Amino acid sequence: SVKVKVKYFARFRQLAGVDEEEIELPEGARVRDLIEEIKKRHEKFKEEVFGEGYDEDADVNIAVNGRYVSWDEELKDGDVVGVFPPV
Numbered sequence: 001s002v003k004v005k006v007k008y009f010a011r012f013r014q015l016a017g018v019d020e021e022e023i024e025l026p027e028g029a030r031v032r033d034l035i036e037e038i039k040k041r042h043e044k045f046k047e048e049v050f051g052e053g054y055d056e057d058a059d060v061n062i063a064v065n066g067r068y069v070s071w072d073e074e075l076k077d078g079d080v081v082g083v084f085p086p087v
Contacts, residue, residue: 002029002077006038009084012060015044016083025075031062032071034081056086 002025008016016038023037039045051058053068063082064073075081 001025002027002075002079004034004075004077004079004081006034007080007082009082011085012045012083015048016042029075030071031064031069031073031075031081034075035062035071038083051086054086058086060084061086 004023004025005020006016006023007020008018013019021041023034023041025033025037035050045060048059049057050060050062052071053061055061060083061068062084063069064075064079066080066082
């Protein structure tokens, strides 16, 4: 298992119902798998468009340990993933 700390920002704190949450993912999990799991846990995210890396046209951008990454970036145990409106 890979356990990541997800930090939600701004209106996504209301959609998630928490400011942060730990998400355990199977071995080999990628950023795209984490996005699917967020949507599974919190159905209000299904309708939100996630961008890949920096994308001002998306509803949501993510960063892993402070960095924009691809959807196929492999997550590591202890990674911190921010979920935020595009900067």
